[PDB]
Amino acid sequence: EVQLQESGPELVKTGASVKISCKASGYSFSNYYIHWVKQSHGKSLEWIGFISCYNGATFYNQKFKGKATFTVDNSSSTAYMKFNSLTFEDSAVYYCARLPIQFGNFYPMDYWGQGTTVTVSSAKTTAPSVYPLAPVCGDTTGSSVTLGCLVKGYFPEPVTLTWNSGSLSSGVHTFPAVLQSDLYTLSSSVTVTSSTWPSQSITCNVAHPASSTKVDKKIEPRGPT
């Protein structure tokens, strides 16, 4: 029944600061260190530092000295990490993890939080352009047909993409967004039987909450010119 519950995702502007929390439960809070660890997408975990929940003492990895500040609120069983002067390179998932005081200094970090994603960018909110991708013009000779939807040039994540308002869920691949020149691009494919489309409408539905936009693009067969 040990749990470390971390605060939610953060989107922060270049040069600003953010403070993320780690709330402990199910154990004697003051008998442990809380460590903080960085996980840049597709890289090894990188240890940042620790704070003692017994007496508040801190120790920081020199690479993060000046960047990260640890605190604890003993009364709420909560540890905090504050980050100042955020840069693109600070975009990562940050974990808290506890480490007992009482089983020697070399005991492992034995319970972890679920992680907090921090995204740092100078970009301004930007609605996507949503493009329907119909097959090459011609004759679909196969038993099935693949359609697409391109969602280009938005910020921030996330978007929601559905096909036929969710009624079309099988045969869908919605691809992770890629970030280029401060903006995201995502695509999705859907594959149906050739007797399904174009005889029945297929529409890609895209929502970008941050611009409060909601677009439907029907996939239309291409003309011969």
Binding site: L4, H35, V37, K43, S44, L45, E46, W47, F59, N61, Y95, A97, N105, F106, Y107, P108, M109, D110, Y111, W112, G113, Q114, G115, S129, Y131, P132, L133, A134, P135, V136, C137, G138, T146, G148, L150, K152, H173, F175, P176, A177, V178, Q180, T185, L186, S187, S189, T191, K217, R222, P224
Partner: protein, 220 residues
Amino acid sequence: QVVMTQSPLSLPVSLGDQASISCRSSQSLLHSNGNTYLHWYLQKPGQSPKLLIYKVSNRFSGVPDRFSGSGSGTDFTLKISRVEAEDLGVYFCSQSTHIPPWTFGGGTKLDIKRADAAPTVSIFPPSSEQLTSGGASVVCFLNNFYPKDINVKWKIDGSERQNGVLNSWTDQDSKDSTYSMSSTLTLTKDEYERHNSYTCEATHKTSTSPIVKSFNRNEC
């Protein structure tokens, strides 16, 4: 700083078989007190890392005996017997013999083995709507293939084109254990409408020949 190196980055295994994940440290993890502080964790997407094995071979609370650890000095192995679907995720090692800092391996992601499958390849010219906007993206989907390694090559009027290409890959599918990929070539409308032929070529171990999908702006 003790550097932990893990292999492989991706480990295919069929359900019911034993998986073996290796960790190497840049410096012996035997402490002068006789103990060796090498530990193994499992992380599933979006979930907290979970401690599995500590001090080379000790199973942590609730960890079943299908998990075992071995090794000494700089070389360590995590063995998972009878791999199941709930075992799927990223496994990573860490050391606490030489601290600070605590350091971590780069992780090994389990891959479910299945029958080889060639990708299904589909190419998409720019939409009329994007062309009206002044842009041109050509999209290629390479769907439902196995194993995960694949290469895509773009050609314009027969000539290889690397600039302007952005790729994205799905994680292994939970239904059929295949992988998929999307590749987008973005050009200015001005440059798109100077050329005639556009081609996406997929190279996958399922054929010595690439799967080629092409279109011509000139005619259907």
